[PDB]
Amino acid sequence: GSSGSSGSRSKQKSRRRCFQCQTKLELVQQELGSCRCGYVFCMLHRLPEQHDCTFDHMGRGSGPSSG
Ligand SMILES: [Zn+2]
Ligand SMILES: [Zn+2]
């Protein structure tokens, strides 16, 4: 038993592999899968909605939503 919340507690240890399924990402994937938030996923979890991405693609300004 090794307890003690110290150091850092992350999940993205090796971008090389997805951050959700930890699958192997080819040279191309690693680039494609990559995201803006700061995490790399596979061709299945590459999309933002897939990993409830925190980033906001809808930027470059703001406006009224309610209609
Ligand atoms: Zn994945
Ligand atoms: Zn993201």
For the CA atoms of 49, 55, 57, 58, the dihedral, rounded to the nearest 10 degrees, stands at: 110
Domain extent listing, the chain: 1-67
The contacts of residue 51 (CB under 8 Å, 6+ apart) are: 19, 20, 35, 39, 41, 45
Q: Residue 1 Cα, ligand 1 centroid: separation in angstroms?
A: 30
The contacts of residue 59 (CB under 8 Å, 6+ apart) are: none
Ligand with smallest separation from the Cα of 55: 2
Binding residues for Zn(2+): 18, 21, 35, 37, 42, 45, 51, 53
A 10 A CB-CB count for 29 gives 19
31's enclosing H/E stretch is: helix 27-33
Give 29's DSSP letter. H
| CATH architecture of structural domain 1-67 | Irregular (4.10)
User: Based on the number of CB atoms within 10 Å of its own CB, is 16 exposed (0-12), middle (13-18) or buried (19 or more)?
Assistant: middle
The DSSP code sequence of 46-62 is -STGGGT-SS-SS-SS-
